[PDB]
RNA sequence: UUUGCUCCACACAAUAUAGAUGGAUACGAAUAAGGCGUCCUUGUGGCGUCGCUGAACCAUAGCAGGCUAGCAACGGUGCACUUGGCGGAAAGGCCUUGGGUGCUUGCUGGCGAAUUGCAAUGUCAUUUUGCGUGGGGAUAAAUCAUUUGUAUACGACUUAGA
RNA sequence: GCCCUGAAAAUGGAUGGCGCUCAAGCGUGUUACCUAUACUCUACCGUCAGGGUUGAUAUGAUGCCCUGACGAGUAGGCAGGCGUGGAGGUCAGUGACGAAGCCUAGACCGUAAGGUCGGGUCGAACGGCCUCUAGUGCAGAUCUUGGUGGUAGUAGCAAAUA
RNA sequence: AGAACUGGCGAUGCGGGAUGAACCGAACGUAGAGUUAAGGUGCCGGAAUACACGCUCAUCAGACACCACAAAAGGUGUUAG
């Protein structure tokens, strides 16, 4: 694969004689490829209404992009998953001016602040919030203070050549 | 870049510096290390200490005579962080290592000549702020090496000498800098100023 | 899975070909899935192929 | 002379000395594919004397060809040299090790005459 | 004035090994000022000869040479693969070879 | 390698030479063979395979 | 021929602190060294700078004898004789030379650098 | 190969010599227009410690 | 199988090898700490 | 002992090379701070400046750099001397005084090279040794043989005998 | 989850070693690079396979030449081969102007089995090709006979006083 | 000790897991040159001292299938929930 892309997959099973023009459903899948996109749409639909790639078809495999990626996206996550034992539930607030990567910080946050593989992960509600108070996590409300700025010490300079002859400082 | 290169020790993290050295060694660049005692390490001294104790009990029982040799000297300890990090059994390796000369303090030859500072070792580069580090000093002090102050004082010497040599060199190239100012304004200067150098 | 590939042309490793998409031969594919890699070929491809 | 033959390559010219003739003097260098159930040589182990597999045979176009381009034939006496009389560019007369200097030199004259390219001219002939 | 080097210092490394056996035909080489593999293409193909010294004079000289040439950018920090009219004795490992700048394309 | 779906180096078997040491017999062959090539006619292909035959595929008629 | 025999300082003039003193050995080595000085004169050479260069010895036909081992056994105790012979060679100094000349072979780009020498200097 | 290296007895012919002047004449005429040109050529060239050939533009 | 009766050893290990010290002359393997606040004098001495 | 040894300036038969080809090119500590200049009211300092790689700084044009002239300066600058001073951590190497001498590319001139045939390291280092140069210096010890015990299987240790 | 607790045995010691601490460690996404008797394209080989081919003032059509494919392998099977003792046949072959044997960090042919040649050695009968004939090929059998060793100038020759 | 399906070994080298008959990738005439498996890219050793999100200090860290063991029961250590 690679990095995520939100796909607008809309399936309606496989229309038969008695089931012409089925009800139809739009489930949102993530991943970089479309084959891995439809694979996820069918397992998830393999968890709702009785089917498999054998009894139904995903009408289309569309894409999804942000209409205003110049504003800071203060997202509020919601996810379901398993564990090296059973299964649990969770909620976060990952910020980023891009949906798919806020979800990558998640698939990484699952393997980092919990050590859990992508497989063991079903992402659900991902809705940016408006009002500052609506924001729960204060370590996300950490960058909401009015009139803000901030510096960064110990600039560990990248060495392209082996031996240096200055023995550098933290200047930054 | 230079035939038999030099290496300043203070700051460097034992391991990182050990491999860049073993590389240039089995490559053909004769290199010598200096001040293996100001050679910073990691975590707390007690840890590494107890770890050295491991090499201290490791020896042949039927004859401690022909057993692993646990060199106490801060330099001899680093020579082991290369010994097992290169083929010192092969004709190539034995002599490959020969380009190597590890030294304590900054002896006379290497104090008049420039000493190199490698970023991939220097603590202020391969370590996290607040995360405790160690020093070859305190370890050797309590492991078998008994020349701590011996060198410690030879630096109060070697250092005090090359120290006032810079105060000279400082104001030397201080008025040589006022000569660079009154060397411009001319075309030979205006020209080279736009021609790169 | 061995005969499937013997009797589906692919005699020696890293070798490929085509088959008409039909539930008939469609079953061989899901029988030796961890033995190959397939997909819908494009004009450009087939040509050079 | 000879003919327009491609480069005479043999790939692995190094004799295939029997396994252990270098260890025992009772074992000659005369190759023999060891039959034993253990034999590292027979089981073909990375770092063992490779056996004479036919994949080492010589290219048909240059098989039997000396670096020159003359396939050494074994000449006997007078009548026997007149054999390759018409092959001065693709065959060579190698005089039999069992030839008396008397009859030996007489043949060498017949050789230079017909353009008979001989390989062992110093044969019993003092220099 | 004092400089007569038109080639560059090519520090000779190991043949073409893995963890086990090596390749006694194509050796791997390093060179002065080569870091960017993108801009490492410049030294590609450039013929290279190692200058070693002998005892018994050959053709009026006792300074023989085994010849070679550049092939493709190996590694990711300015390394280079090379072959030879004759492979090196292995005992030459870890030296400094002469990499001339021809054929050119500047 | 290649999946040996069929035995490798399968000697065709059916004799394409007589185990005869008698030249005359072999000549009939050289003749009939030549026939069973240019003539592109069925009949000789049969006699061509027939001369090879043992004292059994050549029983007394 | 050491094979588990003790030392003896008298043999330290050879750096090898290991030796012995073979008596019946010399008894016959002098009987021959006397015979060689005898034949150096029989021809009439300079019986002075006579430096011996070829002294080699090889085992002789093992004289059969035997000892009686326990449990009625018969193990060999054969005499181990030898075959020596040295050549007393005159020591004439001087050698000078007599070897090769090396017919210098060069190329055009090699003989051209010879003329390039007569341009630099003279 | 029976003299080597008995000087020359084969030096030059002034034929090729003359031809040179019958060239540089107009070449050095354009040099007396762009400053330091002769100076640039009156020198050789070799790789110095510190400079990168692949990065150097020519 | 342990000894049979946990007992003491036979010979200080520190005092080894039993190698015959260089020569009949005893080598002084150490000397007293110096005090530069007192008069000069020796520390060792010979004897038979 | 046939004049055997050895230091220094070089020179020539050699000898091998773990691998010269502009330059190993001197603060120390700080690394959640400092380098330099700088100045005031002398410091854990008022003020400016700076890194952000050495991709620096220096070297660097001439028959492997020849032969000759002059201008502007007397700088810089190699060899061989010397002097003030210093270095013992393996000093054995470094800073300096006054000269002699070499050269100058800081500028302007003026002759030179080809045929190494369009490439062939195309040889310009130093390590060490040898029979012969000649400018000085230098006149032993060791073992073995007898001997001793504080010695020991023997070697060895150990003291002794012009 | 991560880290410690849980966490004790015998020769000192193994994330393979060294070494690793915003890692080279646990998880993970992007990667770029790294090299299998494998696959890629190819040269050559033998076998098998499907073919074209006598055309003569020649031949081996058990030939020549073409296209494709393939090569693991003990026990094991049959094919093509090499060598060796005598027999009938034959190259009116070898040969006291050196056959056989033998030695040969000398050369050639063959995948090879072996053949061939240079030199020494040596002194009397021997090789090729076509068949025939077999007491026909040795590293092994605590293999037989005869030979020679490392052990080894070692153990040790020491009772009947000396 | 014993059964079944398939696979191997035996009898099959090879490159990988330090190492090994069985596993991972893979099979072999001889070579040439590309590309990869497997397996890895501090160093030993061919290959990033690559980049991004993290977590984690241990006066007994951990550090990759088979595989060379660790369990119940705990921590106001520290993070996420």
Curated annotation (Swiss-Prot), chain B:
GO biological process terms, alphabetically, are: cytoplasmic translation; maturation of LSU-rRNA; negative regulation of translation
Q: Name one GO molecular function term.
A: structural constituent of ribosome
Q: Which Gene3D superfamilies match?
A: 1.20.5.4280, Ribosomal protein L13 (3.90.1180.10)
Q: Which Pfam families match?
A: Ribosomal_L13 (PF00572)
The source's superkingdom equals: Eukaryota
Q: What is its main location?
A: cytoplasm
Q: Where is this cross-link: Glycyl lysine isopeptide (Lys-Gly) (interchain with G-Cter in ubiquitin)?
A: 175
**Mind telling me how this protein is modified after translation?**
N-terminally acetylated by acetyltransferase NatA.
Q: Does the keyword Cytoplasm apply?
A: yes
The keyword Acetylation belongs to this UniProt entry's keyword annotation? yes
- What is the annotated role of this protein in its UniProt record? Component of the ribosome, a large ribonucleoprotein complex responsible for the synthesis of proteins in the cell. The small ribosomal subunit (SSU) binds messenger RNAs (mRNAs) and translates the encoded message by selecting cognate aminoacyl-transfer RNA (tRNA) molecules. The large subunit (LSU) contains the ribosomal catalytic site termed the peptidyl transferase center (PTC), which catalyzes the formation of peptide bonds, thereby polymerizing the amino acids delivered by tRNAs into a polypeptide chain.
Self-association state and partner proteins as the record states: Component of the large ribosomal subunit (LSU). Mature yeast ribosomes consist of a small (40S) and a large (60S) subunit. The 40S small subunit contains 1 molecule of ribosomal RNA (18S rRNA) and 33 different proteins (encoded by 57 genes). The large 60S subunit contains 3 rRNA molecules (25S, 5.8S and 5S rRNA) and 46 different proteins (encoded by 81 genes).
Record HAMAP family: Ribosomal_uL13
Q: Hey, which family's this protein in?
A: Belongs to the universal ribosomal protein uL13 family.
State the protein's name: Large ribosomal subunit protein uL13A
Curated annotation (Swiss-Prot), chain G:
Keywords in alphabetical order = Cytoplasm, Isopeptide bond, Phosphoprotein, Ribonucleoprotein, Ribosomal protein, Ubl conjugation
Location in the cell:
Cytoplasm
Q: Report the GO terms under cellular component.
A: cytoplasm; cytosol; cytosolic large ribosomal subunit; preribosome, large subunit precursor
| Primary site of residence | cytoplasm
- Which GO-annotated molecular functions does the record name? structural constituent of ribosome
The UniProt subunit note reads as follows: Component of the large ribosomal subunit (LSU). Mature yeast ribosomes consist of a small (40S) and a large (60S) subunit. The 40S small subunit contains 1 molecule of ribosomal RNA (18S rRNA) and 33 different proteins (encoded by 57 genes). The large 60S subunit contains 3 rRNA molecules (25S, 5.8S and 5S rRNA) and 46 different proteins (encoded by 81 genes). uL22 is associated with the polypeptide exit tunnel.
UniProt similarity note: Belongs to the universal ribosomal protein uL22 family.
Q: What does this protein do?
A: Component of the ribosome, a large ribonucleoprotein complex responsible for the synthesis of proteins in the cell. The small ribosomal subunit (SSU) binds messenger RNAs (mRNAs) and translates the encoded message by selecting cognate aminoacyl-transfer RNA (tRNA) molecules. The large subunit (LSU) contains the ribosomal catalytic site termed the peptidyl transferase center (PTC), which catalyzes the formation of peptide bonds, thereby polymerizing the amino acids delivered by tRNAs into a polypeptide chain.
The encoding gene is RPL17A
The full protein's residues present here are 63 to 184 of 184
UniProtKB/Swiss-Prot annotation, chain H:
Domain of life assignment: Eukaryota
Which residues are connected by disulfide bridges in this protein?
none
- Which subcellular locations apply to this protein? Cytoplasm
Q: Post-translational modification, briefly?
A: N-terminally acetylated by acetyltransferase NatA.
Which sites are covalently linked via Glycyl lysine isopeptide (Lys-Gly) (interchain with G-Cter in ubiquitin)?
A: 10
What's this chain's function? Component of the ribosome, a large ribonucleoprotein complex responsible for the synthesis of proteins in the cell. The small ribosomal subunit (SSU) binds messenger RNAs (mRNAs) and translates the encoded message by selecting cognate aminoacyl-transfer RNA (tRNA) molecules. The large subunit (LSU) contains the ribosomal catalytic site termed the peptidyl transferase center (PTC), which catalyzes the formation of peptide bonds, thereby polymerizing the amino acids delivered by tRNAs into a polypeptide chain.
- What family does the entry list? Belongs to the eukaryotic ribosomal protein eL6 family.
Miscellaneous comment in the UniProt entry for this protein: Present with 37100 molecules/cell in log phase SD medium.
**Subunit composition?**
Component of the large ribosomal subunit (LSU). Mature yeast ribosomes consist of a small (40S) and a large (60S) subunit. The 40S small subunit contains 1 molecule of ribosomal RNA (18S rRNA) and 33 different proteins (encoded by 57 genes). The large 60S subunit contains 3 rRNA molecules (25S, 5.8S and 5S rRNA) and 46 different proteins (encoded by 81 genes).
Name it: Large ribosomal subunit protein eL6A
This protein's species is Saccharomyces cerevisiae (strain ATCC 204508 / S288c)
Lineage runs:
Eukaryota, Fungi, Dikarya, Ascomycota, Saccharomycotina
Q: State the encoding gene.
A: RPL6A
Q: Which residues of the full protein are shown?
A: 119 to 176 of 176
UniProtKB/Swiss-Prot annotation, chain I:
What does the record say about the knockout?
Answer: A mutant confers resistance to trichodermin, a trichotecene toxin produced by plant-pathogenic fungi.
Highest rank taxon of the organism: Eukaryota
Phosphoserine modification, residue list: 23
Q: Report where the covalent cross-link Glycyl lysine isopeptide (Lys-Gly) (interchain with G-Cter in ubiquitin) sits.
A: 38
> Where located?
Cytoplasm
Question: What's the further remark here?
Answer: Present with 450 molecules/cell in log phase SD medium.
What this protein is reported to do is described as: Component of the ribosome, a large ribonucleoprotein complex responsible for the synthesis of proteins in the cell. The small ribosomal subunit (SSU) binds messenger RNAs (mRNAs) and translates the encoded message by selecting cognate aminoacyl-transfer RNA (tRNA) molecules. The large subunit (LSU) contains the ribosomal catalytic site termed the peptidyl transferase center (PTC), which catalyzes the formation of peptide bonds, thereby polymerizing the amino acids delivered by tRNAs into a polypeptide chain.
Give the family from UniProt: Belongs to the universal ribosomal protein uL3 family.
The name this protein carries in UniProt is: Large ribosomal subunit protein uL3
Q: Please give the organism.
A: Saccharomyces cerevisiae (strain ATCC 204508 / S288c)
Gene that encodes it: RPL3
**Stretch of the intact protein here:** 2 to 49 of 387
């Amino acid at each position: 694969m690679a990095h995520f892309k939100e796909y607008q997959v809309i399936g309606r099973r496989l229309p038969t004689e008695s089931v012409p023009e089925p009800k139809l459903f739009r489930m949102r899948i993530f991943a970089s490829n479309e084959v891995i996109a439809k694979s996820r749409y069918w397992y998830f639909l393999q968890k709702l209404h009785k089917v498999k790639k054998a009894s139904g078809e995903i009408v289309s495999i569309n894409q999804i992009n942000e209409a205003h990626p110049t504003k800071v996206k203060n997202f509020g996550v919601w996810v379901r998953y398993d564990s090296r034992s059973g299964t649990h539930n969770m909620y976060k607030e990952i910020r980023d001016v891009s949906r798919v990567a806020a979800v990558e910080t998640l698939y990484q946050d699952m393997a980092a602040r919990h050590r859990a593989r992508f497989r063991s992960i079903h992402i659900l509600k991902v809705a940016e919030i408006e009002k500052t108070a609506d924001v729960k996590r204060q370590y996300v409300k950490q960058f909401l203070t009015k009139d803000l700025k901030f510096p960064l010490p110990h600039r560990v300079q990248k060495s392209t050549k082996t031996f240096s002859y200055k023995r550098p400082s933290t200047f930054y | 870049v230079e035939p038999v290169v030099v290496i300043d020790g203070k700051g460097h993290l034992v391991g990182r510096l050990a491999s860049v050295v073993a590389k240039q060694l089995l490559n053909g660049q004769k290199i010598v290390v200096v001040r293996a005692e100001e050679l910073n390490i990691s975590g707390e001294f007690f840890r590494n200490k107890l770890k050295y104790h491991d090499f201290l009990r490791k020896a042949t029982a039927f004859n401690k005579t022909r057993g692993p040799f646990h060199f106490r000297a801060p330099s001899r300890i680093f020579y082991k962080a290369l010994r097992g990090m290169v083929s010192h059994k092969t004709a190539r390796g034995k002599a490959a290592l020969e380009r190597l000369k590890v030294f304590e303090g900054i002896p006379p030859p290497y104090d008049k000549k420039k000493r190199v500072v490698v970023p991939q070792a220097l603590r202020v580069l391969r370590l996290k702020p607040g995360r405790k580090y160690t020093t070859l000093g305190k370890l050797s002090t309590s492991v078998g090496w008994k020349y701590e102050d011996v060198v410690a004082k030879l630096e109060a010497k070697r250092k005090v000498s090359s120290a006032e040599y810079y105060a000279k060199k400082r104001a030397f190239t201080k008025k040589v800098a006022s000569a660079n100012a009154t060397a411009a304004e001319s075309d030979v200067a205006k020209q080279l100023a736009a021609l790169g150098y | 899975p061995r005969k499937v590939l013997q009797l589906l042309r692919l005699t020696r490793i890293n070798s490929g070909t085509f088959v008409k998409v039909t539930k008939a031969t469609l079953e061989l594919l899901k029988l030796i899935e961890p033995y190959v890699a397939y997909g819908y070929p494009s004009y450009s491809t087939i040509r050079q192929l | 002379a000879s003919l327009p033959h491609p480069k005479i390559v043999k790939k692995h010219t190094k004799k295939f000395k029997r396994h252990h003739s270098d260890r025992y003097h009772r074992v000659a260098e005369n190759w023999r594919k060891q039959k034993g159930i253990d034999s590292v040589v027979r089981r073909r182990f990375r770092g063992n004397i490779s056996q004479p597999k036919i994949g080492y045979g010589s290219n048909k176009k240059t098989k039997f060809l000396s670096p020159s381009g003359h396939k050494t034939f074994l000449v006997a006496n007078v009548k026997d040299l007149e054999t390759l009389t018409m092959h001065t560019k693709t065959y060579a007369a190698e005089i039999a090790h069992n030839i008396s200097a008397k009859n030996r030199v007489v043949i060498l004259a017949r050789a230079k005459a017909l353009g008979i390219k001989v390989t062992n001219p110093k044969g019993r002939l003092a220099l | 004035a004092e400089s007569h080097r038109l080639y560059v210092k090519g520090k000779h490394l190991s043949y073409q090994r893995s963890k086990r056996v090596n390749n006694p035909n194509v050796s791997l080489i390093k060179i002065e000022g080569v870091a960017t593999p993108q801009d490492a293409q410049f030294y590609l193909g450039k013929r290279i000869a190692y200058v070693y010294r002998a005892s018994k004079e050959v053709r009026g000289s006792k300074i023989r040479v085994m010849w070679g040439k550049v092939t493709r950018t190996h590694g990711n920090s300015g390394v280079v693969r090379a072959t030879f009219r004759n492979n090196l004795p292995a005992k030459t490992f870890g030296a400094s070879v002469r990499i001339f700048l021809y054929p050119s394309n500047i | 390698g290649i999946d040996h779906t069929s035995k490798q180096h399968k000697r065709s078997g059916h004799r394409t030479a007589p185990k005869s040491d008698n030249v005359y017999l072999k000549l009939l062959v050289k003749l009939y063979t030549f026939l069973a090539r240019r003539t592109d006619a069925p009949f000789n292909k049969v006699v061509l395979k027939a001369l090879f035959l043992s004292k059994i595929n050549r029983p007394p008629v | 021929f050491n094979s588990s025999i003790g030392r003896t300082a008298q043999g330290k003039e050879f750096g090898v602190t290991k030796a012995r003193w073979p008596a019946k050995s010399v008894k016959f080595v002098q009987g021959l060294l006397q015979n060689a000085a005898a034949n150096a004169e029989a021809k009439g050479l300079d019986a002075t700078k006579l430096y011996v260069s070829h002294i080699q010895v090889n085992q002789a036909p093992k004289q059969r004898r035997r000892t009686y081992r326990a449990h009625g056994r018969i193990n060999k105790y054969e005499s181990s004789p030898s075959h020596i012979e040295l050549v007393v060679t005159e020591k004439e100094e001087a050698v000078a030379k007599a070897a090769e000349k090396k017919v210098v072979r060069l190329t055009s780009r090699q003989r051209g650098r010879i003329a390039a020498q007569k341009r630099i200097a003279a | 190969a029976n003299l080597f290296p008995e000087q020359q007895n084969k030096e030059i012919k002034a034929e090729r010599v003359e031809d040179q002047k019958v060239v540089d004449k107009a070449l050095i005429a354009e040099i007396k227009k762009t400053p330091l040109l002769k100076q640039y050529l009156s020198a050789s060239f070799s790789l110095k410690n510190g400079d990168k050939p692949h990065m150097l533009k020519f | 199988s342990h000894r049979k009766y946990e007992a003491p050893r036979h010979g200080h290990l520190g005092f080894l090898p039993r190698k015959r010290a260089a020569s009949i002359r005893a080598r002084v393997k150490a000397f007293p700490k110096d005090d530069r606040s007192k008069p000069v004098a020796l520390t060792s001495f010979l004897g038979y």
